[PDB]
Scaffold this motif. Sequence first.
Motif, PDB file in Angstrom:
ATOM      1  N   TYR A  27      48.593  40.816  37.652  1.00  0.00           N
ATOM      2  CA  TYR A  27      48.423  39.858  38.735  1.00  0.00           C
ATOM      3  C   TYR A  27      48.470  40.521  40.104  1.00  0.00           C
ATOM      4  CZ  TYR A  27      48.440  35.784  35.745  1.00  0.00           C
ATOM      5  OH  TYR A  27      48.103  34.823  34.827  1.00  0.00           O
ATOM      6  N   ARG A  30      45.044  41.547  40.416  1.00  0.00           N
ATOM      7  CA  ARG A  30      44.169  40.380  40.424  1.00  0.00           C
ATOM      8  C   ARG A  30      44.169  39.688  41.777  1.00  0.00           C
ATOM      9  NH1 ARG A  30      41.437  36.661  37.541  1.00  0.00           N
ATOM     10  NH2 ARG A  30      41.633  34.503  38.268  1.00  0.00           N
ATOM     11  N   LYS A  31      45.321  39.639  42.449  1.00  0.00           N
ATOM     12  CA  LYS A  31      45.387  38.987  43.754  1.00  0.00           C
ATOM     13  C   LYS A  31      44.460  39.668  44.749  1.00  0.00           C
ATOM     14  CE  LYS A  31      46.941  38.770  48.094  1.00  0.00           C
ATOM     15  NZ  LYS A  31      47.180  39.766  49.171  1.00  0.00           N
ATOM     16  N   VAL A  34      40.772  39.021  43.822  1.00  0.00           N
ATOM     17  CA  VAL A  34      40.284  37.651  43.859  1.00  0.00           C
ATOM     18  C   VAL A  34      40.453  36.995  45.222  1.00  0.00           C
ATOM     19  CG1 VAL A  34      42.308  36.265  43.271  1.00  0.00           C
ATOM     20  CG2 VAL A  34      40.086  35.684  42.326  1.00  0.00           C
ATOM     21  N   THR A  35      41.281  37.547  46.105  1.00  0.00           N
ATOM     22  CA  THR A  35      41.546  36.932  47.398  1.00  0.00           C
ATOM     23  C   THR A  35      40.380  37.205  48.334  1.00  0.00           C
ATOM     24  OG1 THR A  35      43.852  37.465  46.952  1.00  0.00           O
ATOM     25  CG2 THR A  35      43.315  36.601  49.136  1.00  0.00           C
ATOM     26  N   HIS A  37      38.127  36.843  51.820  1.00  0.00           N
ATOM     27  CA  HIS A  37      38.246  36.670  53.261  1.00  0.00           C
ATOM     28  C   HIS A  37      38.126  35.195  53.628  1.00  0.00           C
ATOM     29  CE1 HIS A  37      37.477  37.096  57.537  1.00  0.00           C
ATOM     30  NE2 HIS A  37      37.630  38.405  57.465  1.00  0.00           N
ATOM     31  N   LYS A  38      39.109  34.686  54.372  1.00  0.00           N
ATOM     32  CA  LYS A  38      39.162  33.248  54.622  1.00  0.00           C
ATOM     33  C   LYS A  38      38.034  32.775  55.530  1.00  0.00           C
ATOM     34  CE  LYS A  38      41.426  32.194  52.111  1.00  0.00           C
ATOM     35  NZ  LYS A  38      41.371  30.871  51.437  1.00  0.00           N
ATOM     36  N   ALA A  39      37.626  33.583  56.510  1.00  0.00           N
ATOM     37  CA  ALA A  39      36.449  33.236  57.297  1.00  0.00           C
ATOM     38  C   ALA A  39      35.163  33.315  56.483  1.00  0.00           C
ATOM     39  CB  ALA A  39      36.342  34.132  58.526  1.00  0.00           C
ATOM     40  N   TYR A  41      34.360  31.413  53.868  1.00  0.00           N
ATOM     41  CA  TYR A  41      35.130  30.243  53.458  1.00  0.00           C
ATOM     42  C   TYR A  41      35.144  30.010  51.954  1.00  0.00           C
ATOM     43  CZ  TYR A  41      35.733  28.998  58.293  1.00  0.00           C
ATOM     44  OH  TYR A  41      36.098  28.997  59.618  1.00  0.00           O
ATOM     45  N   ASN A  42      34.004  29.667  51.363  1.00  0.00           N
ATOM     46  CA  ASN A  42      33.947  29.404  49.932  1.00  0.00           C
ATOM     47  C   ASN A  42      33.057  30.373  49.174  1.00  0.00           C
ATOM     48  OD1 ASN A  42      35.423  27.465  48.393  1.00  0.00           O
ATOM     49  ND2 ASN A  42      34.594  25.836  49.689  1.00  0.00           N
ATOM     50  N   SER A  64      35.674  33.015  40.541  1.00  0.00           N
ATOM     51  CA  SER A  64      36.975  32.379  40.418  1.00  0.00           C
ATOM     52  C   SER A  64      36.986  31.029  41.113  1.00  0.00           C
ATOM     53  CB  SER A  64      38.064  33.263  41.004  1.00  0.00           C
ATOM     54  OG  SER A  64      39.347  32.754  40.713  1.00  0.00           O
ATOM     55  N   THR A  65      37.628  30.056  40.473  1.00  0.00           N
ATOM     56  CA  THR A  65      37.883  28.747  41.051  1.00  0.00           C
ATOM     57  C   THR A  65      39.352  28.404  40.842  1.00  0.00           C
ATOM     58  OG1 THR A  65      37.237  27.566  39.035  1.00  0.00           O
ATOM     59  CG2 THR A  65      35.517  28.019  40.648  1.00  0.00           C
ATOM     60  N   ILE A  66      39.761  27.244  41.355  1.00  0.00           N
ATOM     61  CA  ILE A  66      41.136  26.802  41.149  1.00  0.00           C
ATOM     62  C   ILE A  66      41.361  26.428  39.693  1.00  0.00           C
ATOM     63  CG2 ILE A  66      42.876  25.120  41.808  1.00  0.00           C
ATOM     64  CD1 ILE A  66      42.617  26.602  44.160  1.00  0.00           C
ATOM     65  N   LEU A 147      44.291  46.355  32.703  1.00  0.00           N
ATOM     66  CA  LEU A 147      45.389  47.284  32.476  1.00  0.00           C
ATOM     67  C   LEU A 147      44.922  48.662  32.041  1.00  0.00           C
ATOM     68  CD1 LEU A 147      47.711  44.809  30.589  1.00  0.00           C
ATOM     69  CD2 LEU A 147      47.717  45.395  33.006  1.00  0.00           C
TER      70      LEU A 147
ATOM     71  N   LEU B  26      47.670  32.439  42.162  1.00  0.00           N
ATOM     72  CA  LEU B  26      46.464  32.733  42.923  1.00  0.00           C
ATOM     73  C   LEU B  26      45.778  31.505  43.504  1.00  0.00           C
ATOM     74  CD1 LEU B  26      46.401  35.667  42.875  1.00  0.00           C
ATOM     75  CD2 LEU B  26      46.848  34.982  40.531  1.00  0.00           C
ATOM     76  N   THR B  67      41.007  33.439  60.013  1.00  0.00           N
ATOM     77  CA  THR B  67      40.822  34.885  60.033  1.00  0.00           C
ATOM     78  C   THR B  67      40.867  35.426  58.612  1.00  0.00           C
ATOM     79  OG1 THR B  67      43.178  35.094  60.557  1.00  0.00           O
ATOM     80  CG2 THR B  67      41.622  35.243  62.370  1.00  0.00           C
ATOM     81  N   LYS B  68      40.961  36.749  58.458  1.00  0.00           N
ATOM     82  CA  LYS B  68      40.771  37.368  57.147  1.00  0.00           C
ATOM     83  C   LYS B  68      41.771  36.848  56.125  1.00  0.00           C
ATOM     84  CE  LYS B  68      42.592  41.432  56.514  1.00  0.00           C
ATOM     85  NZ  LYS B  68      42.593  42.372  57.666  1.00  0.00           N
TER      86      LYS B  68
END
Lengths: 294, 159, 169, 58, 218
Positions: A27, A30-31, A34-35, A37-39, A41-42, A64-66, A147, B26, B67-68
């Motif tokens: 994980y 994975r974070k 999978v994370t 960039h928030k700008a 957006y989707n 990836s989705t929720i 792994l 996540l 932002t990021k």
Amino acid sequence: QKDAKSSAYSSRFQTPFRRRREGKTDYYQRKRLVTQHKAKYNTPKYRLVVRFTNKDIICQIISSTITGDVVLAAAYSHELPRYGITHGLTNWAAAYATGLLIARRTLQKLGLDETYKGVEEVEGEYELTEAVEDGPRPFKVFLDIGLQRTTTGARVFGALKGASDGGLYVPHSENRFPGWDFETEEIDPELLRSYIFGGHVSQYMEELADDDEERFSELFKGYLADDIDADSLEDIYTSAHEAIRADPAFKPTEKKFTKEQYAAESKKYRQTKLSKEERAARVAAKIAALAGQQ
Amino acid sequence: GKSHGYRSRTRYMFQRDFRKHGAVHLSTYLKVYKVGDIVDIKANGSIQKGMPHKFYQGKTGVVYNVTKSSVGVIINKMVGNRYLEKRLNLRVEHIKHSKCRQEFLERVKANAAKRAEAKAQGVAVQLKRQPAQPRESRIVSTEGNVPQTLAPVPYETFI
Amino acid sequence: QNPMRDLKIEKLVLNISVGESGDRLTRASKVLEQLSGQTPVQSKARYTVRTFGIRRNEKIAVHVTVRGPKAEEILERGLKVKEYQLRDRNFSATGNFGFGIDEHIDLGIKYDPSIGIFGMDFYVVMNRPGARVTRRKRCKGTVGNSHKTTKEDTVSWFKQKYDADVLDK
Amino acid sequence: AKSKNHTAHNQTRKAHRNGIKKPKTYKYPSLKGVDPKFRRNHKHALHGTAKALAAAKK
Amino acid sequence: ARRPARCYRYQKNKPYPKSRYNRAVPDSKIRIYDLGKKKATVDEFPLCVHLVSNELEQLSSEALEAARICANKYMTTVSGRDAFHLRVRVHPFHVLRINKMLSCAGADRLQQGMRGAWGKPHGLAARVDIGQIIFSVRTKDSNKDVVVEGLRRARYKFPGQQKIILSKKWGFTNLDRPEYLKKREAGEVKDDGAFVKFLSKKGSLENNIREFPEYFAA
RNA sequence: GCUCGUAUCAGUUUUAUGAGGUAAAGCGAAUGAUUAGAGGUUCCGGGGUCGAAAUGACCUUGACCUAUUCUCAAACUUUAAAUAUGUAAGAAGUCCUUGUUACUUAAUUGAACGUGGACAUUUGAAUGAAGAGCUUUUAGUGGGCCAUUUUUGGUAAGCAG
RNA sequence: GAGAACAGAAAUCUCCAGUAGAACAAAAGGGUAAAAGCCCCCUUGAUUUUGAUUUUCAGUGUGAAUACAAACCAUGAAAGU
RNA sequence: GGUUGCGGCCAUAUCUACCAGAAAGCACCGUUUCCCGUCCGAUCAACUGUAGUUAAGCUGGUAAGAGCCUGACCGAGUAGUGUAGUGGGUGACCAUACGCGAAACUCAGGUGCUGCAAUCU
RNA sequence: CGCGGGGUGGAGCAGCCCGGUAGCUCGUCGGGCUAGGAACCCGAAGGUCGUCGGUUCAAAUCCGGCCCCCGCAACCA
């Protein structure tokens, strides 16, 4: 003193995530995989998941989705016999072929097939999918190794090379490929090409035939039975390459049955949970028999 | 002397949880935030970057900047005898969506549907919400429910 | 049943825990290397105690681990100096066992005045196929109770193989 | 000569004399603190849409 | 010389136990909390008598020890050592403080007054509430008057008001007398060292069979 | 005074939705305290038979294992109120082929801002509104004290906080 | 806990149990398990430019911190950091 | 319904002890020329899928199982608490009025659900 | 009444600070050629450290619970 697990211990125990208990997913990695960039957006982040079981390779393009992950396209090594590879369905050359197949399948699905035609004449050199001017950018995926151990000459990077040559733009360096030398930081194009085309198995065939005939008859017995030679396995690997670049459309199987038939048979065999009434019945029978001394 | 540091008297506020320590699942990273979204702030003790101050724990604000790995949140902080604009640069670990507005959007959708049905038929929609009304007349029977007379009990030690 | 749960030697570890570091440990490493056909690894002290004359990270000991037919050969040549007479005390609860010997020349190594006499502690770790389940990386598991090695099955295996004998107490 | 050290007595009453009226909200809040890459693109896009609207209704 | 208990009667401060922050407090004057035939079986002493508090106040360790000595002495004098089991059921954990100073002519020459007036530990007290038991004595029903009189004697060493209540439970159990009687003529109860073990309708049946065999072999 | 004219409002409730670790409670739940009582070898204590030999073997005080509910915690806690506390309850709102962009996207994918389009006499809980909002400038003050409730130091104080 | 010569309460080695009861420069509190602990490999982002923001706040300063922008780098297969 | 790859929530999923598992899958398993890494091909790397096995892992079932989850007019409208009185009481504290309202305990039930892709008498 | 020294052979001082734990002075008998002696130092016993929990670096001196003047303590009224 091993069995000192008080009810307090079991109560204050925090169980890890299910996949962490199962030992399947990292994980922490994975974070970061999978994370998004928030700008951004989707817009999804795509992973080229590569997994190596015994006698099989699994390559997937996963977003990836929720509610869970979503598969774009999947290429299994056990399907490569249709394209013309039956033996060594987990070795490095098969990993490259499966990666090539998954890249071609993804480009066929997305309509980015004619543009970014890939590397049809591979030479074992380092090269990324260069974006075309005034045109759509190449489909970008990031390698997900799970792994598995990142080391030079690994089949995860074999699948990486196969997909990158197929046409996907997956960012990578050349120092995990076979042919990279530690002392001199350079890549051997011919060593990488031989690993791509099965040279590392043909060479073993030659040496084993020369020195130990019993081992050659024991392993490589399928090669002997099909009368496949060390000089011809390169031909079969390249023939599979051209076949994959010809028809990567993923025709599935027939299942030989229905989901209903499989369900009926498996359910008929599988053990069934005891009802609560018969649970109480078993308890009370134990009271009546064991305690009563008959 | 006295001590008023950034994380002063946050011993229990930023405590993680009971049996909820460790890594962050996540979905908090798969959630997306747009400018204008209403977000509750609840700091994650595990993540120490982009941490809100203890004042903003449990405060609800509006996104003004994405932002990021962060969002900018507008909050009205009470300072003296007035409200001042505060702009926090927080991480999505500490950020979470707010359902307070989402209930209202569901109600406005239902109101629009009832409005359309009214424009169709005219059946006294009564869109407006109302408080709980005083109870109306009802008739309770005793058939199988004859009243049971109760009396105060005598005092006994019980110890 | 017993298709493939028959006991086998997972590994055999030879250690010599010298009091100090320096020439003594160098020669202990030399004899361990000669006996095991491979370079050993030296272990430093976990902490410092003045009574034993050890400091932290001071290279207290030298140990090596062997696997396979070489492990079997070393085990039998170290059992010869025991005359195939072990004890249920020497056998462990988790199915492994071990025994300490002195005067390593008894194993068949000629005396050299510089090297001197050195004692070691053989320890055999017993297992059956399937320990990869608990030793691998992906999808780790713990072996089942039926598959778990034990003191009783280990002593039975040891008195069956080598036609040896375990002391009464 | 010790004295009083601190008290919040009478402070809330003083605040509420002419006090805690809510902040005055505005349509079009200030874009200060926003990502400058976004701000650059917003300048360019607003220029473009102004040009398009002028072309539509000159 | 210690301060009169009127200075520490009431629960004015927060609980102030000996801890990592006090770490130097006097030892409690009461150290023994069980007296009499404390090894007796539950069946042996069916009657229980309580001396319970009727005030929210602090009971000194000194007073607790004095009252325990007095009640124990009276019961051993009148009915015998093995005729009862007395349990002091309040443990003095609250630490009382004292601002100590010289008490002499010209005392303001070293006093410093109220500056830095935080006290140092000088005593221990038990913080008792309304209806909280102070003493619990279990004995045979023949010893009811002896036990109530011993508790009445112990009452004189305590500040505030206390009550003597005859418990409806069997001894030091939490079972009423007839309910325990029914559970004992059944097979649910078991004799522990001095208390009673219970059989529940939960847990592993093998362990339940291994214990409490009389209930199951019925 | 100014800009306006019943709202670009409220020391209030309601509805919806957050945050908290105090009161209480708990300790056969963590940590730290804490009182009693079953069996086991003295290697994992001491006091004794079957003595010129152990761990054939038993009794006492005590140490650890159990199952035990005697009592507790401002700087202990799984749980956890009440009172206080953030936000929302619309027209600057809800929904639609997206027009612009050097941002973003594999991609007229999104993001932001928009044109145009569907929606009042019920424009979306209650109560009040005694006008709402907005400036400019300047006085005095910057020793406080008391009461209920919460609360700290102190034996306490018409004590100190 | 069980086990292995000297070796015992403490030396090195081996299995089992082990929710962290360890460690993390320092006070304490939070936090951390394929890590934030231990070990190894590489390295200098402890760099440049000038703004915005949070805390104390008069919404002054100082200290500290936060999220970006434009660069230039480090690391890694890469996402990223 | 079984299995796998990637997951979402993160114990109804954990823990202990016994059983069963057809097919496929997973796995253990066989080998050391190359890439690679170790004192040790044990891990990790590569190769064969051939030599064998469901022994283990894994999955499921069982248990008046521990734990966990849910619910209750179960305890309990109790503890606590906002508001009120020229109420009681020397006091400590307590009762009442208008509201809110627990935790432990007891009992009851349950013991993963689910998404994407592939695949199997 | 101010954290100020230990309650160590009969008495007063080491050892307390680095881990198989009788270190100086009194007495009883020998040492030792003595002609008795006086003296000399060598040995035997004499401290199980005022005393409860220890977390065992075998802890009771380097964890904690009660009396003793001292290296001395005032300030202007």
